[PDB]
Design a protein around this ligand. Structure first.
Ligand code: CLA
Ligand code: CLA
Ligand code: CLA
Ligand code: CLA
Ligand code: CLA
Ligand code: CLA
Ligand code: CLA
Ligand code: CLA
Ligand SMILES: CC1=CCCC(C)(C)[C@H]1/C=C/C(C)=C/C=C/C(C)=C/C=C/C=C(C)/C=C/C=C(C)/C=C/C1=C(C)CCCC1(C)C
Ligand SMILES: CCCCCCCCCCCCO[C@H]1O[C@H](CO)[C@@H](O[C@H]2O[C@H](CO)[C@@H](O)[C@H](O)[C@H]2O)[C@H](O)[C@H]1O
Ligand SMILES: CC1=C(C/C=C(\C)CCC[C@H](C)CCC[C@H](C)CCCC(C)C)C(=O)c2ccccc2C1=O
Ligand code: SF4
Lengths: 60, 107, 30, 33, 161, 42, 80, 138, 732
């Protein structure tokens, strides 16, 4: 995956699980969840972006 | 109070069907209904309705008809306010229909 | 009909059941 | 009623003495350290 | 006839209901002068009551011992107009409403701000959609068979089990 | 006609009220000219 | 006392620490996120359980979690 | 170290102050320094005037002290406040800020308490840990 | 403080919350400090012994209080005229007119008139005097003492059973099916043949003569000979007077069908053959599982093998064996569901086919029995779903249930909940629309425009059972059908006589009001199921709270964040479904009581014309039948209904008090209690007195529960007072 790609989320506890977001930035340092994904639907707390690991993210 | 005021003087609003005062009987029943409907908002809480709305959102998502404006349960304050508004409307309407039918018939 | 002695016999049986119930309650309470 | 004295003996005991002693001893039990 | 009921055009209790309604309106009519607007209104109500009871008596409706028409809804064709045909009319209108609403939602998803399209309706586009709903069963079935109605289970959000 | 007034007229409460009043007027006029339709005549 | 846990999805935004009315949370050094810091709960005996920290948390499902447990005078917020 | 001789803000008193549990179980103290005499709202209800210089005030709860601290931080730009816990024996326990640095700022020497090394969705099921002293975090 | 000795966290609570939560978690043994599985099962076994002893003591108390203060010996002589006495009244708060007004039943002291029907049951099973009633009370006292001793003994060391004994499914199933169901039914058939039927035929049989008084003149020789039909010959004549030999038969096992023409109850010989056949069938069922001798079925093999090969159920029933055996909440949910279904079945079948002599003429007793067992049924079904939700929180292991039927329920829970929501909204929209449509059109003076749907499906079922009212002419209502010819020699004459006589509640005639009230019942059942199923399936987590299983089955909320999370736990779904359960049993009992009251009055057309709109229910059932109840006491005097007249108002009070805990919430009450704490601490001559526990407001879950308790008690007491006093005032 790369910046700007459309990805599906595989984190089970996530609000956007099996929904589609857009990758905004992939951090290169040793971060546990380096994939910033921005979503068009807001969560219950009103946020629309979250960080995920590579294995919680699949390109569509 | 239960027998000689409530039971005795409600005879006019419950026997109003088929007369000109039948609108008071209809409003009597409808106001009992709205009052009881208010207790769903007053006695319950938001999280149950949000999870039920999650299931209904799954149903609309299955047919690709989920709305862009995401449906949410009413806020806790709005749940209290809606329950109070329908409670006051139901109780005041019940007394309204009962008083008006009774006093128009006997006075 | 029922006599006084029969009621007393029933009361004695109920007292025995009370003692057994107290023992079961103490056993369940560890 | 045979043994008609038994209601007048037992009803005040069961309704006032039994709950008073139960409430007192339960109070002592639940408040003691 | 069906379920022991009798046709309303020969039930004596149906006639008793009609007679009681006409008498109840006529005793009100008695207190007004002929030519007054209350008298004309009451006579029109009497005429409407008579026409309604005549029409119900000539329609093949079945009346019970209460004296009121009882509907049969088991599927028999002799009573298909009591539930089945109103049901088909409702199902046509309701499928129309659902189809045009779904079409507008899918159009609004394509807009610049979809939520603005939800609260401020594009009226010409919405009127186009509500025009499209007359052929909703065939359109909806073709939408279904082409994979455009049902979305797969791996593309819908679900809670942790 | 002003486009902003038309956009206000296209809002959900106004269009909701107009459409439901229009539907109610259809039901009312249908029941005025064809009253007491308990059944589909067949 | 209540139990407060911080999971490694924390991004170190310090919002939960700023939202805490009882000084339960604090920021400690970490390498798991870009901010270089993670929340911690060393003072959960003062936790009243208000869940203002969870309200402040911006990560999809929360990084800070409060599990209500045994009630004490401090956790019940009793001034008497 | 709490100086007990620090003067208090001029307050006319209220019924919202500390009860018998303050003198029997524990009490809290907050000190701060103001550049001028100015009126602030008491967390127990009422208006008090803090003096120029040092101010010592006694409360029943830690949350009342931290609410007063937040009020004087956001309305008077006072950040030097210190919150202590006092026991009936006379023991004073310094509470806030614990290491001198505010908790929203990272300070060296702090160790993480309650940190879990996985996401919240990786917790164990209750049936896995039933009749067993394992924590649900794993 | 060491009252909650099972919870260290509760015992260190400094407030009044400690006492409440120790009271409310006392029997939740799985959550106690240091609870092991073996200790849990042993405590449950002893507690079950204690509940059995409580049941036996309660039944012995009913028997004793009747044998001492009742009029059973007077009631046996004249069963249709003498009012049955439950117990005596000794209340020192009575005035003299209340003493006079409660002096009924032919005795000289104040009494309560029994509505439980224990007279009819005990008379039918052969009890005649007060002496055998007293002997039965003594025997049940002894039995309760025996079970208390057994509960104590099976907790003593070297008698505490192991977990392998408790989880022995096959042995317990075989013994409980063959012995507890089968041999108990066979022994009850023996009691009916040996004792109850001879006492019904005017012949005394007791322990002093039952070994010399043969139940049948031919003895056991036809049974050992294979000439079993001799036991069916010479049944009771239609002129038989119950409890006498006049018109009595000699048969002990018949299949007559229908009712005894005098008692209006089922034939006792039919009941004896029924319980004999049930015993034989159940003993055959109880030899099915393998325990020690190679033959028999293995439950695990049956469960694992029944996977449909088309794969629509996934892995089928694999892992269900361990999941059910390891979870007591799964077992409790299954048991409570089956019990609730069967007590509903008891309520329907006992009014429709009464078995006790002369109880069909006791209208108050029939109303009380139906209402009682239906409310018990609603409680049991709510409990089944609640403990199923508890199983999902506490005992469901997903890894042990891979692709199982349980896992696939969890995987299509959204479809299940959404389709339940759809069917509830469907039913409610159109049922309420038809009722409101009928209300408006009757109010405007045109009842002929009502939408009145004939319930032809259920009428067709009645005709299939032989009801000739509707002219459907199918199955048993057709004289040429193979179903008619098949049963014509055995039970068809008596059954056809009972179903086509309009003197009983056997398949009562139904119209459009019946149609509407069953569809309202369907609405209420589907909606209560929606709440309960949605609570059970979202108990482990939702989108709003994906880690709900970490928080347990019951917790107040998850705070105002994420939009607000009030009533999000599965316990809260139990709490919400309790109101809907009360609503559905209210609708069911309202329907039963109004239909039966109009039928008993000879005015069934009043129900047929007024039940199609809501104002008819409010006016002709609630308002009309409230008049003798609300006149139990008045400014002119009082009568025996006054207690119900009190209890009615009592119910209307406590129900309303429940509202206070369900509408007002905690923080208001906590601030009031803080002001009260200040007031007590600052008041002279009262601050010498100090509380040991700090006063706090009730917790969120506790207040929900307390409001539910006051609400439910008001519901039950209000309706019980109404139904008993209204039936008594109209008919008794
Ligand atoms: C089943 C329980 C029960 C029983 C047996 C009684 C019995 C009685 N009540 Mg009643 N009562 C009860 C529950 C009960 N009550 C409840 C729950 C309430 C609250 C609604 C009331 C409220 C109530 C009121 C308001 C009044 C009564 C009165 C009476 C008396 C009737 C009139 C009379 O002749 O008194 C004549 C009275 C006497 C001759 C005095 C008797 C004094 C007794 C024997 C002293 C006992 C001391 C004590 C119990 C020792 C044990 C302490 C230990 C438990 C810690 C009678 C003693 C009336 C009365 O007279 O009160 C005295 C009265 O005014 N009751
Ligand atoms: C575009 C319109 C639309 C469509 C096609 C659906 C489709 C569906 N809904 Mg839904 N719904 C909608 C709007 C819609 N909904 C709205 C606005 C609400 C809020 C009141 C709901 C509330 C709702 C609930 C609570 C439930 C459903 C359910 C369902 C399903 C079963 C059908 C049903 O019960 O209908 C009944 C629908 C209603 C009672 C509400 C409809 C309200 C109006 C009449 C429809 C909107 C018309 C719209 C204004 C058209 C504008 C188009 C124009 C701009 C061109 C199905 C997936 C059920 C389900 O999950 O079944 C599996 C269920 O339980 N829906
Ligand atoms: C889902 C419930 C439901 C259903 C199935 C119906 C169905 C019907 N109603 Mg009813 N109604 C309902 C709810 C319902 N209503 C409610 C809730 C109210 C109160 C607000 C009313 C108040 C009402 C009145 C006052 C009248 C009806 C009428 C009618 C009939 C429609 C005739 C018509 O428009 O011809 C359509 C004709 C065309 C040419 C097209 C039809 C049998 C009318 C009627 O004829 O009664 C028999 C009538 O006068 N209804
Ligand atoms: C033949 C041997 C036998 C018998 C008679 C029983 C009997 C019983 N066992 Mg059991 N048990 C057995 C062998 C046996 N067990 C074996 C071999 C094992 C080891 C594998 C166990 C292990 C075991 C455990 C672990 C437990 C029991 C329990 C029970 C009791 C269940 C509660 C009860 O009273 O239900 C009574 C039920 C009936 C009489 C019939 C069922 C009712 C249905 C719904 C039909 C009734 C309808 C009918 C119309 C009612 C008419 C009455 C009306 C007119 C008033 C019951 C006394 C439980 C208990 O309470 O322990 C103290 C318990 O926890 N058993
Ligand atoms: C749904 C109901 C059901 C089902 C499907 C089964 C199924 C089974 N049970 Mg079970 N059982 C049940 C209810 C049920 N049971 C109940 C209700 C009870 C108790 C009241 C029992 C009690 C029970 C016991 C105690 C045992 C079983 C056993 C068995 C298995 C034996 C299979 C068998 O008979 O092969 C036998 C094979 C044949 C009969 C084939 C016939 C052989 C030849 C072809 C004869 C024909 C010859 C010729 C054509 C005919 C003319 C002959 C002439 C010349 C004389 C089988 C899996 C046994 C087992 O294995 O346990 C696992 C066992 O021990 N069951
Ligand atoms: C034979 C039937 C049966 C049995 C054995 C149980 C047993 C249990 N239930 Mg259950 N329940 C039942 C019927 C039953 N219930 C019914 C009919 C309902 C519906 C009203 C419920 C509703 C219910 C709820 C909502 C809850 C329980 C809970 C509990 C547990 C603790 C009870 C407690 O602490 O109360 C102690 C009460 C007293 C000492 C007062 C006397 C315990 C395992 C609770 C629990 O801890 O589960 C997690 C819980 O939250 N049950
Ligand atoms: C008389 C009181 C009343 C009524 C009508 C309802 C109605 C409803 N409840 Mg409910 N509830 C109540 C009391 C009531 N509740 C109480 C006291 C509690 C205890 C807290 C609950 C607890 C509860 C739970 C826990 C659940 C429900 C559910 C439902 C819905 C499905 C059942 C149904 O019939 O769908 C049909 C709907 C109706 C009959 C509602 C009336 C619709 C009206 C008549 C349409 C007309 C609107 C009108 C034109 C608006 C004009 C207003 C304008 C002039 C200002 C429905 C909205 C369930 C649900 O959401 O299922 C999907 C659910 O999960 N309720
Ligand atoms: C899902 C909705 C629903 C539910 C839960 C029930 C439930 C019930 N009905 Mg009812 N019924 C329904 C819809 C429903 N009905 C409809 C739509 C009609 C036609 C008007 C009827 C007509 C009807 C009659 C005539 C009788 C019952 C009776 C009963 C009871 C016994 C079971 C039975 O006969 O099932 C019947 C239900 C069905 C056969 C199907 C229901 C489920 C489907 C999906 C409904 C959808 C129909 C669809 C919209 C129409 C198709 C288009 C058509 C116009 C061509 C039970 C309370 C009996 C009764 O009152 O006993 C006392 C009875 O005699 N029902
Ligand atoms: C949620 C919870 C989580 C996990 C645990 C859990 C407890 C398992 C679960 C809850 C499950 C809940 C508690 C489930 C509760 C469930 C309900 C109450 C089960 C009712 C079943 C009715 C059966 C199918 C009998 C039907 C009659 C039919 C066969 C008759 C036909 C015919 C008969 C023979 C004779 C003539 C009539 C006709 C009609 C011709
Ligand atoms: C070996 C292959 C075939 C085996 C068949 C066995 C059949 C069952 C045997 C039944 C039990 C034993 O039966 C044997 O003692 C019974 C004792 O009550 C006798 O029964 C006799 O006494 C009973 C009690 O007073 C009477 O009710 C009977 O009318 C009378 O016949 C049987 O007449 C006798 O045959
Ligand atoms: C029923 C209920 C809900 C559900 C109520 C929903 C979310 C609101 C429904 C609003 C509708 C959509 C607007 C008007 C409804 C009309 C009758 C028909 C729909 C019109 C559409 C065109 C929108 C809560 O959100 C809630 C929250 C907190 C405490 C109690 C409760 C509560 O009891
Ligand atoms: S629950 Fe409240 S007191 Fe506890 S850590 Fe979170 S914010 Fe602080």
């Amino acid at each position: 995956v790369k910046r700007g790609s459309k990805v599906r989320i595989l984190r089970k506890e996530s609000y956007w699980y099996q929904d589609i977001g857009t990758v905004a930035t992939i951090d290169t340092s040793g971060i546990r969840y380096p994939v910033v994904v921005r979503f068009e639907k807001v969560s219950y707390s009103g946020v629309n972006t979250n960080n995920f690991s590579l294995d919680e993210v699949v390109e569509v | 109070w239960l027998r000689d005021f409530l039971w005795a003087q409600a005879s006019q609003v419950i026997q109003s069907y088929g007369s000109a005062l039948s609108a008071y009987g209809l409003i009597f029943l409808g106001a009992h209904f709205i009052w009881a409907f208010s207790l769903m908002f007053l006695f319950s809480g938001r999280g149950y309705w949000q999870e039920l709305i999650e299931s209904i959102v799954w149903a609309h998502n299955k047919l690709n008809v989920a709305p862009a404006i995401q449906p949410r349960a009413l806020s806790i304050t709005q749940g209290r306010a809606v329950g109070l508004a329908h409670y006051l409307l139901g109780g005041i309407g019940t007394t309204w229909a009962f008083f008006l039918a009774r006093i128009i018939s006997v006075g | 009909m029922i006599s006084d002695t029969q009621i007393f016999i029933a009361l004695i049986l109920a007292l025995v059941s009370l003692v057994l119930a107290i023992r079961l309650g103490r056993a369940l309470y560890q | 009623m045979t043994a008609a004295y038994l209601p007048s003996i037992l009803v005040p005991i069961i309704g006032l003495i039994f709950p008073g002693l139960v409430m007192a001893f339960a109070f002592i039990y639940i408040e003691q350290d | 006839d069906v379920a022991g009921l009798t046709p309303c055009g020969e039930s004596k209790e149906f006639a008793r209901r009609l007679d009681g309604s006409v008498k109840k309106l006529q005793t009100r009519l008695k207190k007004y002068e002929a030519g007054t607007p209350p008298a004309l209104a009451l006579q029109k109500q009497i005429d409407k009551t008579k026409n309604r009871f005549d029409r119900y008596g000539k329609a093949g409706l079945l009346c019970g011992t209460d004296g009121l028409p009882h509907l049969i809804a088991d599927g028999r064709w002799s009573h298909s107009g009591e539930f089945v045909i109103p049901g088909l009319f409702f199902l046509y209108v309701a499928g129309w409403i659902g189809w045009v609403g779904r079409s507008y939602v899918l159009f609004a998803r394509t807009a610049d701000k979809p939520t603005e399209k939800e609260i401020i309706i594009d009226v010409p586009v919405a009127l186009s959609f509500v025009s499209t709903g007359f052929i909703w069963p065939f359109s909806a079935f073709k939408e279904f068979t082409s994979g455009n109605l049902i979305v797969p289970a791996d593309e819908i959000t679900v809670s942790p089990r | 006609m002003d486009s902003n007034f038309l956009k206000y007229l296209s809002t959900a409460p106004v269009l909701f009220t107009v459409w439901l009043s229009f539907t109610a007027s259809f039901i009312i006029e249908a029941n005025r000219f064809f009253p007491d339709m308990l059944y589909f005549p067949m | 006392s209540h139990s407060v846990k911080v999971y490694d999805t924390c991004i170190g935004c310090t919002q939960c620490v700023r939202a805490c009315p009882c000084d339960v949370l604090e920021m400690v050094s970490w390498d798991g996120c870009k901010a270089g810091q993670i929340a911690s709960a060393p003072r959960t005996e003062d936790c009243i359980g208000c869940k203002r920290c969870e309200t402040a948390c911006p990560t999809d499902f929360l990084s800070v979690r409060v599990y209500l447990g045994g009630e004490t005078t401090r956790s019940m917020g009793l001034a008497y | 170290t709490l100086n007990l001789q620090i003067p208090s803000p001029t307050f006319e008193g209220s019924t919202g102050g500390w009860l018998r549990a303050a003198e029997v179980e524990e009490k809290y103290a907050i000190t701060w320094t103001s550049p001028k005499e100015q009126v602030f709202e008491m967390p127990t209800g009422g208006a008090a005037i803090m003096r120029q210089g040092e101010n010592l005030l006694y409360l029943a709860r830690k949350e009342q002290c931290l609410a007063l601290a937040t009020q004087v931080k956001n309305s008077f730009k006072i950040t030097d406040y210190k919150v202590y816990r006092i026991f009936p024996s006379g023991e004073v326990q310094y509470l806030h800020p614990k290491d001198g640095v505010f908790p929203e700022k990272v300070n060296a020497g702090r160790v993480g308490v309650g940190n879990v090394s996985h996401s919240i969705g990786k917790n164990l099921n209750p049936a896995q840990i039933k009749f067993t002293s394992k924590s649900f975090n794993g | 403080t060491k009252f909650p000795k099972f919870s260290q966290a509760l015992a260190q609570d400094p407030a009044t919350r400690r006492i409440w939560y120790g009271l409310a978690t006392a029997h939740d043994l799985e959550s106690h400090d240091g609870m092991t599985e073996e200790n849990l099962y042993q405590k449950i076994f002893a507690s079950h012994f204690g509940h059995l002893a409580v049941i036996f003591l309660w039944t012995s108390g009913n028997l004793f209080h009747l044998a001492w203060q009742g009029n059973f010996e007077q009631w046996v002589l004249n069963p249709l005229k003498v009012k049955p006495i439950a117990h005596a009244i000794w209340d020192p708060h009575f005035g003299q007119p209340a003493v006079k007004a409660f002096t009924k039943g032919g005795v000289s002291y104040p009494v309560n008139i029994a509505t439980s029907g224990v007279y009819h049951w005990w008379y039918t099973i052969g009890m005649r005097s007060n002496t055998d009633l007293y002997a039965g009370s003594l025997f049940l006292l002894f039995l309760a003492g025996v079970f208390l001793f057994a509960g104590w003994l099976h907790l003593q060391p070297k008698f505490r059973p192991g977990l392998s004994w408790f989880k022995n499914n096959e042995s317990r199933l075989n013994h409980h099916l063959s012995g507890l169901f089968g041999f108990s039914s066979l022994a009850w058939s023996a009691h009916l043949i040996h004792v109850a039927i001879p006492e019904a035929r005017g012949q005394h049989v007791g322990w002093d003569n039952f070994t010399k008084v043969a139940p049948h003149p031919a003895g056991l020789q036809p049974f050992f000979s294979g000439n079993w039909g001799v036991y069916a010959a010479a049944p009771d004549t239609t002129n038989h007077i119950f409890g006498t030999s006049e018109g009595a038969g000699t048969a002990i096992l018949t299949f007559l069908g229908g009712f005894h023409p005098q008692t209006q109850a089922l034939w006792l010989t039919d009941i004896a053959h029924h319980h004999l056949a049930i015993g034989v069938v159940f003993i055959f069922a109880g030899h099915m599982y393998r325990t020690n001798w190679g033959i028999g079925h293995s439950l695990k093999e049956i469960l694992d093998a029944h996977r449909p090969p088309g794969g629509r159920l996934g892995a089928g029933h694999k892992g269900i064996f361990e999941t059910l055996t390891n979870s007591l909440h799964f077992q409790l949910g299954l048991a409570l569901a089956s019990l609730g279904v069967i007590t509903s079945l008891v309520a329907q079948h006992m009014y429709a086919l009464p078995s006790y002599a002369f109880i069909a003429k006791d209208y108050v007793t029939q109303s009380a029995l139906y209402t009682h067992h239906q409310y018990i049924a609603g409680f049991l079904m709510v409990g089944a779903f609640a403990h199923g939700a508890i199983f999902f929180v506490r005992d469901y292991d997903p890894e042990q249930n891979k692709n199982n039927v349980l896992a696939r329920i969890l995987d299509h829970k959204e479809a299940i909940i959404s389709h339940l929501s759809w069917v509830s909204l469907f039913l409610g929209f159109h049922t309420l629309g038809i009722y409101v449509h009928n209300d408006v059109v009757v109010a405007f003076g045109t009842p002929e425009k009502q939408i009145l749907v004939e319930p032809v499906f259920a009428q067709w079922i009645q005709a299939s059972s032989g009801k000739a009212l509707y002219g459907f002419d199918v199955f048993l209502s057709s004289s040429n059908s193979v179903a008619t010819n098949a049963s014509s020699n055995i039970w068809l004459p008596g059954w056809l006589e009972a179903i086509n006589s309009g003197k009983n509640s056997l398949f009562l005639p139904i119209g459009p009001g019946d149609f509407l009230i069953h569809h309202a019942i369907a609405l209420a059942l589907h909606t209560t199921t929606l709440i309960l199923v949605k609570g059970a399936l979202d108990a482990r987590g939702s989108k709003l709270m994906p880690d709900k299983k970490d928080f347990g089955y019951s917790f107040p909320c998850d705070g105002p964040g994420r939009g607000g999370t009030c009533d999000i736990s599965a316990w809260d779904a139990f709490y919400l479904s309790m109101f809907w359960m009360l609503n559905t049993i209210g609708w069911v009992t309202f329907y039963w009581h109004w239909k039966h009251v109009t039928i008993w009055q000879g005015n069934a057309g009043q129900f047929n014309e007024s039940s199609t709109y809501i104002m008819g229910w409010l006016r002709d059932y609630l308002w009309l039948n409230s008049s003798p109840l609300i006149n139990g006491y008045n400014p002119f005097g009082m009568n025996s209904l006054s207690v119900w007249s009190w209890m009615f108002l009592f119910g209307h009070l406590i129900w309303a008090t429940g509202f206070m805990f369900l509408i007002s919430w905690r923080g208001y009450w906590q601030e009031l209690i803080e002001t009260l704490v200040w007031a007590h601490e600052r008041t002279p001559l009262a601050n010498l007195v100090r509380w040991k526990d700090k006063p706090v407001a009730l917790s969120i879950v506790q207040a929900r529960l307390v409001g539910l308790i006051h609400f439910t008690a008001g519901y039950i007491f209000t309706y019980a007072a109404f139904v008993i006093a209204s039936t008594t005032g109209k008919f008794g």
